[PDB]
Design a protein around this ligand. Structure first.
Ligand code: NDP
Ligand code: NDP
Ligand code: NDP
Ligand code: NDP
Lengths: 337, 337, 337, 337
């Protein structure tokens, strides 16, 4: 309904397309893809996926500049400079920025220069970019926002249950550590990053790094400003991560009561965003889960009556991509066109 | 002087022998190895190691029942039943119990049935077994102890710096999470295991599992009884782990002061046990670390002035094995003639 | 129909059940499972699988000899000694031997001693045990065989296209190497193993070992007796393997002719057993393929006009289990009764 | 004594420096490194290495544009365009091309435009570029060659023993498959790549791909022109690979005679280049071996008296780098000022 582009057909760009494809009566219309790798590459990697498996749909190249998914043709262009895009010419309403390189206003704005009406960054925005997490603060979105951010995968897993903890128990302060699957931003073998730790062979190490949620939860939950901080430990799994949150709360409590609080929200205001799992599972079991965060109930602990530790699972690729679709639906729903 | 026997030539048993081989003027004499796998196996796996690399020493079989390391002939026996071992006949003073199956008094005691004078379990002891962590409470060891425990790798990493935190700031309570390398106790592919999570493919998942390290810390640091708890996350790396500790302390502080407190101890009472690393390193850098615990200084955080988060690295196989040697050395030094 | 019992509820045992569950109008009725790990374990590991994903069926324990799959109750017993199994009492017609420890006549026979009418070993049989590979020599099966073998996963990948090569070009001699995913028989970390190479950390090494696929091929294709040999290279992937076969043929040929030969069989006598893939795919893309062998057409080479090199993919767990089901179906179809 | 510059401080670039550092009385003087990543990054990654371990040398940054190794300062520049490099200004005699992007004459020639006297590509050269393999055809090198190639890692493993096989038995034709560790050219997670197979998650798949090694082996051993071909299977190991070569020979033989032939050469003309291992080892055991190729003797087979299969290990990073140093040594030894 809404004319959508995908700038950056990588893990999130492709997960997004496949997430979108599975939705019924979607308001979005993905008409174009900017894949610097080309048509053959876009069709191949969309069909065959090391993490999601083979796409259950007819996918093929259509000519020299498009691909088709179950008959639907999707234009495919290739340009590293978004100021060279044909968004205006195509009448593109929303650009899904998934390249990871245009996360500030001047960068994402290049899409507007090219004629796109709006931009949704699949990552934290740098600068003065409205950030939103579905199930946490999306009601604050307004059609005037020309550039928005859907935050990070970790922020999407944390914020939902942090919101519950703060409302029910009141968070004085907390820390978080995410044991995170590796991502394309890491090097296969010891190379070159900025980040000397992400420069190291990712399938061989536990890699401490930069955390991507910590301040950002305060962005979507202002009451938490200056109350949280954390880090990330990248480990040798290709997908699915888990956050370990420890917080001192003002109201004394115990593990079972904390879990109960999560189940209540899970069955109500956070249905489809938060889930609570009582089974002794491991990361692989959470692949392709549509929720943003799944509490591992049996792992919840309370020390000294007010120090609560919570363990939550998240599919950083798929679960996050479903949220990108959700945020895109909101954009469409609140359109002033 | 101390005639030593290694029961269970596995990861720890082999790491132990190589750790011991590297010491100068050792008061220990490893005369025999109980390897149910045989002499060829013992010689081969001691020489070639997927984690430590090839042993820089002349290793070979010596007849049917021995092996030699740089000329030093060692005996090799094979019996799954410790009562039937020739410890008395051989005059064995101390047995390094590294099978992982004789961790209680009745089990480890079988070595005493057999004639050994003392047993040192390379793991937490079950029941009433004296537990010691070098650099924390080893001064409490007495020659009267027939059976002793060197705790777990995680306890050895945690205790040292927990001791420092408690002394300098006073720990009210806290929680810990160890992102741990897999170990032989896990299954390569989904297979039977009493622990339904450890039963799952170890190189494919992030596996949550219980840990006693929290309560064990209280064993060697009584002041901490009932103040800690935690869990473990087994991840797809073959060696080297990291502990994430969050504690509320009584004295307000900040990250750099906390890191300073650790360096002070590291340059003094905990020299050779605790180190503080200021480099942006990853898990493979810490292989073959003779200390028990290395603080990653740049990851230390303090929230709300009294919630301290510390990240510490540890080579669970080698570092721990150097501690086993250390404890053995203490046994030999306190032996009563 | 045909009261089937699964002995050994491991990778194959569970893949088998799931493969069977997916069949329509199956002549087989799986009524019992001997799982030494217990009911809870059986239900859990059948539901959650690190390789196949979460089973899309209602699986739960059935109060505690039993489990239920979509309402179908399956009895669960636990005994490491087959002679003590209630096969006779239950009227069990065919036992799927998937423990990997009862592969000879005396061992597998234990199931007959226990009352089972027939045994199907999910592996090469030791000694005089009729071996069959569907699509190659299954027409030779007779109800008189009390104990049969479905060969190995590599033999099931190799035989089908070797049969084609021998008929179409005539194999003078050849060699084979299978770059095989690791299996439960390997060790997670360096540990005891009769085979000093499989004793080594499986996810950290390229491990050369044995196979019997070569001589086993001769079993189902007599014309090939003494004409082939080979080895295996176990690598760090959890599932899916690939065979590299090099043979000198009597009739000069070229790569595309060879590929054509495979497509002819694939569309005819070997439909559902052999496939030919023209896509530039990788191992993960072949997960859950029902065929026994998939030729990677673009990799086919011919040197000196008569030295043919063929690369074929196979899902060693799933593809092989579909063959077990197939052979079981034949057993049922030829039952006297 | 030869002024050497390293272009592209990656896996090979760094392995090269470390190999060079370990040589005694080297005729090479590495005075500069072109690392687009910067000084801090060059120092760090040279010191800490996921595959080689921590560099046993004092490594630090020296100012804003150099690094020091045990006191020796090495200049560090940063430019992606070789024409702009200060080779002429610095008087650079030989440039080690390890970027992987300047492999043809026009590309590597950019270094000559920049003032360098000679270029050594650490990879197969494209077009008319003299290719050499130490121990095979290096005696053919002449100072007139402004741009030379040290071939590929697999070519360096294969050529040496292929040379023996051809001389001793006469190779009519053959095929080869290399089960190769992943390299930086692959993607960590499904991502864009001209090669649709190399685009797939490298630590999750058996990856089928190129090797010009077969035709390259022809380049250094003319007698083998048009007689060999092959492919590569990239697998989930970070370093160390193995080649499987099958060849029909004109002189009937047997496995032990073939192994003998390799030991003869290994103790004589190919000492330091080829080795023969009789131990049942796995890939990890061959890390950091200086030789180019190590035959795994117990794996050698001969079918039909003339079809020879040989398995050889090689450390693709380190062993190859040792050859780069050897070839650089030749350049210095044959310099004509
Ligand atoms: N790895 C192995 O086993 C072997 C590999 N190959 C060897 O040599 C290769 C190099 O691969 P390897 O050492 O593995 O890999 P790497 O990616 O780690 O090596 C060198 C690399 O050069 C880069 N570089 C790229 N473009 C430029 C440029 N324009 N100017 C300056 N520096 C540049 C790097 O930059 P950036 O940081 O942007 O990537 C990086 O450190 C060839 O491509 C070839 O195959 C051959 C033999 C053995
Ligand atoms: N991966 C996850 O779990 C999640 C990641 N983040 C993701 O959104 C990101 C994208 O990461 P992800 O999808 O993982 O990764 P990828 O590398 O796989 O995703 C997108 C990529 O964009 C590239 N690209 C780069 N520059 C341009 C350009 N100038 N014009 C057009 N296309 C371009 C690609 O090109 P090239 O081929 O040259 O690399 C590639 O397919 C942000 O960087 C962020 O973190 C957020 C949430 C979840
Ligand atoms: N791995 C680490 O990082 C550390 C582990 N723990 C280590 O100590 C353990 C040993 O683990 P680890 O060395 O890793 O493991 P491994 O399995 O490699 O070590 C010892 C093992 O003893 C076996 N063994 C078992 N039962 C007997 C028996 N009845 N008689 C004789 N030998 C026997 C072996 O036999 P079999 O061949 O049949 O398996 C094998 O070599 C405890 O169980 C504990 O946790 C503690 C600290 C550090
Ligand atoms: N995996 C593959 O790709 C294929 C494997 N093979 C296999 O069939 C095999 C089975 O291996 P796989 O399914 O991989 O592996 P697993 O280890 O997972 O399968 C079966 C296993 O049986 C065990 N078991 C062992 N001894 C007994 C006993 N005495 N009584 C009852 N149950 C027992 C188990 O017990 P415990 O819990 O103590 O280990 C476990 O679930 C053969 O050994 C063979 O190779 C053949 C074709 C394909």
């Amino acid at each position: 309904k809404l004319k959508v582009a995908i700038n950056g057909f990588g893990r999130i760009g492709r997960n997004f397309l496949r997430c979108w494809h599975g939705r019924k009566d979607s308001p979005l219309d993905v008409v174009v893809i900017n894949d610097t790798g080309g048509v053959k590459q876009a069709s191949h990697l969309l069909k065959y996926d090391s993490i999601l498996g083979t796409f259950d749909a007819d996918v093929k190249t259509a000519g020299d500049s498009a691909i088709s998914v179950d008959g639907k043709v999707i234009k495919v262009v290739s340009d590293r400079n978004p100021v060279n895009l044909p968004w205006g010419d195509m009448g593109i309403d929303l650009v899904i920025e998934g390249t990871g390189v245009f996360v500030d206003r001047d960068g994402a704005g290049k899409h507007l220069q090219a004629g796109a009406k709006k931009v949704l960054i699949t990552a934290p925005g740098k600068g003065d970019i409205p950030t939103y997490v579905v199930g946490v603060n999306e009601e604050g979105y307004t059609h005037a926002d020309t550039i928005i951010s859907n935050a990070s995968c970790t922020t999407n897993c944390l914020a939902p249950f942090v919101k519950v903890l703060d409302q029910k128990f009141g968070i004085i302060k907390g820390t978080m550590t995410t044991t995170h699957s590796y991502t394309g931003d890491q090097r296969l073998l010891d190379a070159s990053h900025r980040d000397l730790r992400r420069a190291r062979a990712a399938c061989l190490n536990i890699v401490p790094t930069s955390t991507g949620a910590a301040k950002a939860v305060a962005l979507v939950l202002p009451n938490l400003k200056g109350k949280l901080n954390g880090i990330a430990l990248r480990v040798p799994t290709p997908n699915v991560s888990v956050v370990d949150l420890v917080v001192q709360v003002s109201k004394k409590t115990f593990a079972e009561e904390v879990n109960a609080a999560f189940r209540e929200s899970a069955d109500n205001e956070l249905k489809g965003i938060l889930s609570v799992c009582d089974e002794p599972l491991v990361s692989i079991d959470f692949r392709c889960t549509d929720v943003s965060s799944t509490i591992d109930s049996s792992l919840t602990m309370v020390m000294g009556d007010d120090m609560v530790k919570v363990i939550a699972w998240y599919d950083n690729e798929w679960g996050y991509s479903q949220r990108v679709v959700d945020l895109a639906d909101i954009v469409a729903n609140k359109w002033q066109g």
